[PDB]
Design a protein around this motif. Structure first.
Motif, PDB file in Angstrom:
ATOM      1  N   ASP B 118       0.923  -1.196  -0.037  1.00 23.94           N
ATOM      2  CA  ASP B 118       0.184   0.144  -0.057  1.00 23.94           C
ATOM      3  C   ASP B 118       0.834   1.435  -0.080  1.00 23.94           C
ATOM      4  N   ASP B 119       1.955   1.224   0.589  1.00 23.86           N
ATOM      5  CA  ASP B 119       3.024   2.470   0.428  1.00 23.86           C
ATOM      6  C   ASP B 119       3.696   2.429  -0.757  1.00 23.86           C
TER       7      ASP B 119
ATOM      8  N   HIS E  55      -8.583   7.273   3.338  1.00 23.40           N
ATOM      9  CA  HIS E  55      -7.482   7.216   2.418  1.00 23.40           C
ATOM     10  C   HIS E  55      -7.625   5.902   1.669  1.00 23.40           C
ATOM     11  N   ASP E  57      -5.434   3.450  -0.447  1.00 24.88           N
ATOM     12  CA  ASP E  57      -4.167   2.896  -0.582  1.00 24.88           C
ATOM     13  C   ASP E  57      -3.932   2.658  -2.157  1.00 24.88           C
TER      14      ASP E  57
END
Ligand SMILES: [Zn+2]
Ligand SMILES: [Zn+2]
Ligand SMILES: [Zn+2]
Ligand SMILES: [Zn+2]
Ligand SMILES: [Zn+2]
Ligand SMILES: [Zn+2]
Lengths: 54, 143, 155, 227, 67, 252, 23
Positions: B118-119, E55, E57
């Motif tokens: 996800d980062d 948020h 992702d």
């Protein structure tokens, strides 16, 4: 004086009709011409005896 | 008075996409609206993209693409058509190649899912992939 | 320039001469591709035109090599086209009379343009000058929006 | 709805070309008056003129005010709507205003009504307009090199631009306070001051029934200072 | 039975306009670009709605930031 | 003169500031470009740039064209396109005002449409319904980082600032209200200044708080409601009458 | 118009090829 009107085709992503946004709008009646409401009767005996029952 | 579309330089499209990652100005304010509009057609786009999945014998499949001038959408215009018997032959070859691979390999490393965290963002095709060469596809070696 | 597969026929003999020239173009394109975060709109468009003009120059180079200079072999040219170092359609246009110079294909699609007509860059500068003189004003524009075209230079 | 009303654009605005090519985006914006969708029309006045002219207000609004849809001026006289209403108020009457309701709902409502506003009733029928015009017409008939002065006896109504322009005609900086009238004029050079003075409601010393004038100045000055 | 009168496809319709151009892009490039595009779209939508606390992702796995 | 030289760049786009102001909240909102999850404290700040007009003003692409609108970013003193800009780069004058006088009824000198009503603050670009030429000048306390200056000093500095950008009809500082009322010769000029000194500093190099100019909150240049004072009301009325006489004679 | 006039005038553009400066 004379002029040519055109409709430019717009991007089919952007909203077709940018203007319309579901406004609440109160209507003015515009009953500028007056109109009668016109009933022909005059009941006294039955018209006054009845309300005591009604 | 007609003419076909301009086979543009794909570099242009890439540039556009790069531009529309850091979107935070009154510049491209209407382009954001464009993006929103494009949600209508995003599933269509997805379908097209999955339609032209490169088959397991295609190393690096190119494809024709329509794209919004603001890079709000990227369609895969080409329809993925094939000579039916030829297609069958290709899949057959991959069926036997795959089967062979299964036969030979003692262990078979699968891909971990999902591939990226996800980062980690969607890495740029130009910066990482377009330089490095792809591995050899699957196809049984023919006489 | 696409990506070298098994299905890629390798470049014929005379490519070794040209590689470093179009290499530069490739490098430029890489330079021209990145988030040069131009808050401004006009300048952002300018960057895009830089890629466009660069593309034109690269394709123009190959066209020159093939047709005007008459240097490179036909097979090589074909290969280049296939790989898409140079745009084929643009070259075709160039070959045709009238468009000997031509920024790009987008400037001659009368459909895309709201007025059913080509990009103003296609108007020869002289004509525009004449128009301006007749009116009183000067050349109102300096480059079109579709590509960085200060006149498309039919002449 | 159907495109029943045509656009109401004036001449001056639109420009002197025998044939322009304008475009119409239907349902193309909320207007600048009544927040209400309408057919937005727009055009470059010339081909190579950079400024597009877009139809700001809606046609109903235009009719209502009896104005241009691009200029916001009366279609007859090409003048500000408020100004024309003032003129109309002045001749033939005492009071003619065209009150726009500054509340977002009510404005819409008002726009919807097919009823002309104060001045619009006059200017719509050309006969009445003409009548108004004729009535209006009837109604009609020693140099120490200081570079820094202190001017007095300044009419309360006069602006600084008038002053400076006058000075230029007689030829820099300037300071005026209409309360005090201590017009603290200063020149960009002393030579220029000399030039000015040599070239000469112009009461003018050179500090760095006139008596009563001084008193009037005095009191006014004092008041200004207290403020 | 597919209805025949509607022979104006989506892509064809889009092709007709000026606001689209066409290019030969690698399928991987198309994919990655479309993930980027899709991500931008959905984030734009969410932010537009106002709820910035959701948020996205990059793996399209939506979750809230705060309680 | 401005017409003698080409317009210099205010600031190169490298030097230009980003669109990510101050983190006023916990998270950034992509579709709005504002911040969110918190509106703790005031948003406004002081302009890094200012229209130094003689050092900046000049020719453009527009001065070739006859573009009738002036550069907002020129007024703000931050235009990143100097001579290559389409919007003009100089102080509005009688010639240019006169030139655009048709269109400027409906919209500003910055080529943006006016509205029915003033934005409740009288803060944004003016309404079309009024032809106002009078800017209210709040936030002088903030504009000078709480510098205890004299009223005379204040009014003089204000004069120095707005007189530079446009021909003045009058100015008057009010001690009792700590503000200005800066009537201009023309509406275009008024518009121009109103942006040109929005969020600016009244401070100067001679002042000691010169390096703290950024840290305060800039000039609150808004539009002015007409005074309740009948002393000026009468004058206004007279002016209106005079104007009316002009136009009315012009009709025939 | 003389074709040599266009020959002299298309070198006045300070840039080369499609983008000319033309001052
Ligand atoms: Zn082009
Ligand atoms: Zn062009
Ligand atoms: Zn061109
Ligand atoms: Zn008009
Ligand atoms: Zn309206
Ligand atoms: Zn500018």
């Amino acid at each position: 004086h004379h002029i040519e009107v055109v409709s430019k085709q717009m991007d089919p992503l952007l909203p077709r009709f940018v203007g319309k946004k579901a406004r609440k709008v109160v209507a003015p009646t515009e009953n500028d011409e007056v109109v009668p409401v016109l009933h022909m009767d005059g009941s006294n005996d039955r018209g006054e005896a009845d309300p005591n029952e009604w | 008075l007609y003419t076909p579309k301009a086979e543009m330089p794909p570099e242009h499209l890439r540039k556009i996409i790069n531009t529309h990652s850091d979107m935070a100005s009154k510049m491209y304010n209407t382009d954001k609206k464009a993006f929103l509009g494009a949600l209508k057609y995003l599933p269509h786009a997805i379908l097209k993209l999955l339609e032209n999945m490169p088959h397991p014998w295609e190393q690096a499949k190119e494809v024709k693409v329509l794209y919004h001038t603001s890079g709000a959408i990227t369609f895969v215009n080409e329809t993925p058509r094939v000579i039916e018997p030829v297609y069958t032959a290709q899949w057959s070859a991959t069926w036997i190649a795959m089967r062979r691979e299964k036969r030979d390999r003692t262990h078979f490393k699968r891909m971990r899912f999902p591939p990226f965290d996800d980062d980690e963002p969607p890495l740029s095709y130009e910066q990482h992939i377009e330089n490095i060469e792809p591995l050899d596809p699957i196809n049984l070696p023919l006489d | 320039p696409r990506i070298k597969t098994r299905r890629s026929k390798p470049a014929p003999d005379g490519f070794e001469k040209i590689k470093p020239t179009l290499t530069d173009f490739e490098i430029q394109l890489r330079d021209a591709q990145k988030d040069k975060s131009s808050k401004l709109a006009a300048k952002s468009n300018e960057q895009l035109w830089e890629i466009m003009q660069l593309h034109h120059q690269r394709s123009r180079y190959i066209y020159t090599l093939y047709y005007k200079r008459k240097a490179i072999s036909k097979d090589l040219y074909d290969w280049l086209i296939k790989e898409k170092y140079a745009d084929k359609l643009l070259i075709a246009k160039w070959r045709k009379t009238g468009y000997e110079k031509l920024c790009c294909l987008r400037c001659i699609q009368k459909n895309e343009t709201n007025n059913g007509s080509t990009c103003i860059c296609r108007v020869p500068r002289a004509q525009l000058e004449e128009e301006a003189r007749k009116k009183g004003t000067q050349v109102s524009f300096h480059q079109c929006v579709h590509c960085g075209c200060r006149g498309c230079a039919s002449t | 709805e159907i495109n029943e009303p045509p656009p109401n654009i004036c001449e001056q605005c639109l420009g002197d070309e025998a044939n322009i090519r304008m475009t119409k985006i239907p349902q193309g914006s909320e207007c600048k008056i009544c927040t209400l969708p309408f057919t937005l029309y727009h055009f470059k006045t010339s081909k190579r003129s950079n400024n597009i002219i877009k139809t700001l207000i809606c046609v109903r609004c235009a009719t209502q005010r009896n104005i241009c849809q691009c200029c916001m001026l009366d279609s007859r006289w090409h003048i500000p709507i408020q100004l024309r209403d003032h003129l109309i108020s002045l001749v033939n009457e005492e009071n003619v205003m065209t009150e726009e309701a500054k509340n977002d709902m009510m404005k819409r409502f008002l726009s919807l009504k097919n009823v002309k506003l104060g001045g619009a009733q006059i200017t719509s029928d050309p006969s009445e307009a003409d009548n108004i015009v004729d009535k209006l017409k009837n109604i009609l008939l020693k140099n120490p090199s200081t570079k820094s002065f202190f001017l007095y006896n300044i009419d309360a109504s006069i602006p600084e631009w008038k002053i400076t322009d006058t000075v230029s005609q007689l030829l820099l900086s300037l300071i005026v306070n209409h309360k005090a009238k201590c017009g603290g004029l200063r020149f960009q050079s002393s030579e220029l001051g000399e030039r000015f003075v040599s070239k000469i409601i112009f009461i003018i010393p050179w500090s760095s029934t006139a008596e009563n004038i001084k008193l009037s100045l005095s009191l006014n000055k004092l008041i200004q200072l207290e403020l | 039975l597919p209805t025949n009168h509607n022979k104006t496809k989506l892509l064809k319709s889009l092709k007709n306009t000026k606001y689209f151009q066409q290019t030969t892009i690698d399928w991987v490039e198309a994919g990655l670009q479309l993930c980027r595009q899709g991500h931008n779209m959905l984030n734009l939508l969410i932010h537009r709605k106002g709820l910035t606390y959701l948020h996205l992702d990059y793996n399209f796995n939506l979750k809230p930031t705060k309680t | 003169s401005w017409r003698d030289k080409s317009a210099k760049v205010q600031v190169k786009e490298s030097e230009l500031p980003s669109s990510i102001p101050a983190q006023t909240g916990l998270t950034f909102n992509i579709w709005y470009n504002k911040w969110s999850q918190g509106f703790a404290g005031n948003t406004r700040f002081v302009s890094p740039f200012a229209l130094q007009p003689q050092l900046h003003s000049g020719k453009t692409r527009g001065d070739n064209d006859g573009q009738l609108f002036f550069c907002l970013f020129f007024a703000k003193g931050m235009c990143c396109l100097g001579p290559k800009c389409e919007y003009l780069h100089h102080i509005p004058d009688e010639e240019d005002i006169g030139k655009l006088a048709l269109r400027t009824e409906v919209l500003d000198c910055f080529g943006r449409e006016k509205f029915a009503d003033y934005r409740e603050d009288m803060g944004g670009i003016g309404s079309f319904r009024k032809k106002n030429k009078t800017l209210y000048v709040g936030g002088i306390d903030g504009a000078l980082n709480s510098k205890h200056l004299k009223p005379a000093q204040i009014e003089s500095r204000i004069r120095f600032v707005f007189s530079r950008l446009g021909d003045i009809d009058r100015i008057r500082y009010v001690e009792s209200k700590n503000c200005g009322f800066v009537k201009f010769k023309y509406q275009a000029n008024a518009e121009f200044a109103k942006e040109a000194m929005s969020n600016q500093t009244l401070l100067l190099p001679s002042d000691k708080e010169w390096d703290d100019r950024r840290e305060g909150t800039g000039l609150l240049v808004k539009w002015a409601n007409e005074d309740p004072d009948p002393a000026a009301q009468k004058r206004l009325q007279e002016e209106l009458k005079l104007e009316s006489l002009n136009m009315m004679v012009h009709l025939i | 118009f003389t074709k040599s006039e266009l020959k002299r005038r298309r070198k006045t553009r300070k840039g080369d090829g499609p983008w000319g400066s033309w001052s």
